[PDB]
Design a protein around this ligand. Structure first.
Ligand SMILES: *[C@@H]1O[C@H](CO)[C@@H](O[C@@H]2O[C@H](CO)[C@@H](O)[C@H](O)[C@H]2NC(C)=O)[C@H](O)[C@H]1NC(C)=O
Ligand SMILES: *[C@@H]1O[C@H](CO)[C@@H](O[C@@H]2O[C@H](CO)[C@@H](O)[C@H](O)[C@H]2NC(C)=O)[C@H](O)[C@H]1NC(C)=O
Ligand SMILES: *[C@@H]1O[C@H](CO)[C@@H](O[C@@H]2O[C@H](CO)[C@@H](O)[C@H](O)[C@H]2NC(C)=O)[C@H](O)[C@H]1NC(C)=O
Ligand SMILES: *[C@@H]1O[C@H](CO)[C@@H](O[C@@H]2O[C@H](CO)[C@@H](O)[C@H](O)[C@H]2NC(C)=O)[C@H](O)[C@H]1NC(C)=O
Ligand SMILES: *[C@@H]1O[C@H](CO)[C@@H](O)[C@H](O)[C@H]1NC(C)=O
Lengths: 49, 109
């Protein structure tokens, strides 16, 4: 939408949780589990491929 | 709100014009400009409680902390009407110490 403006990635993930109706404390208080789940989900794609 | 469906930027409004066998759309959009960098933090710890912005981000100009809206820089001081509380400050990665100002009790002298 213009020039790239940097933001830390967990803070971008919190904006995106807001965009679906969940408060952002739910992301910050679960950060490690959410990242573990994303990593297992990405590791399952290359296994199916 | 569909990205790039009505031009580049944040769609404000669009005007139609007729062409021969066709149509022309003049899209008016909003484009952000002249950014500055800041230090930032996800929450703020005060009295053993974690504070999150209601809307906006916590930013630091070098020595002081403010809340701003995310798309236009307009800094304000962090109060209990700017933020909400959840939990204690032991669980959030990158939490920062600052004071969150209450209006009522300095009204009550
Ligand atoms: C929410 O669901 C997750 C499942 O992804 C739970 O986390 C797992 O809990 C089991 C316990 O049976 C552990 O063995 C796993 O190692 C956990 N997974 C990860 C990625 O940490 C989590 O406990 C659930 N939360 C609640 C409150 O029920
Ligand atoms: C960050 O902004 C603050 C403004 O709040 C500057 O601090 C001073 O703060 C006092 C009381 O809050 C004001 O009376 C002053 O007018 C403010 N400015 C000055 C120049 O004294 C602070 O200087 C700013 N810091 C940086 C690094 O820009
Ligand atoms: C951002 O990354 C920096 C590393 O570049 C982290 O700084 C380190 O913090 C640890 C404490 O967890 C210290 O032991 C290291 O000495 C620091 N390294 C440097 C180079 O400063 C910083 O903590 C990270 N920020 C967050 C919020 O995790
Ligand atoms: C932010 O403020 C809290 C509140 O005091 C600090 O917590 C103290 O941390 C030190 C060192 O980690 C401990 O020795 C104290 O026992 C803690 N106090 C309490 C009341 O728990 C915290 O360290 C501060 N954060 C930073 C980065 O300085
Ligand atoms: C912000 O700082 C970075 C270096 O950390 C620099 O590359 C960038 O151009 C700066 N942008 C602005 C708007 O100051």
């Amino acid at each position: 939408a213009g020039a790239a403006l940097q933001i830390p990635f967990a803070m971008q993930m919190a904006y995106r949780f807001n965009g679906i109706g969940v408060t952002q404390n739910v992301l910050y208080e679960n950060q490690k589990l959410i990242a573990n789940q994303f990593n297992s989900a990405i590791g399952k794609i290359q296994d199916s491929l | 709100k569909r990205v790039d469906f009505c031009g580049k930027g944040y769609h404000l409004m669009s005007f139609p014009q007729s062409a021969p066998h066709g149509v022309v759309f003049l899209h008016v959009t909003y484009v952000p400009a002249q950014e500055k960098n800041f230090t930032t933090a996800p929450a703020i710890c005060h009295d053993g409680k974690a504070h999150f912005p209601r809307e906006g981000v916590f930013v630091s100009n070098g020595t002081h902390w403010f809340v701003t809206q995310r798309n236009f820089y307009e800094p304000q001081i962090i109060t209990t009407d700017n933020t909400f509380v959840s939990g204690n400050c032991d669980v959030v990665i990158g939490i920062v110490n600052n004071t969150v100002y209450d209006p009522l009790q300095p009204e009550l002298d």
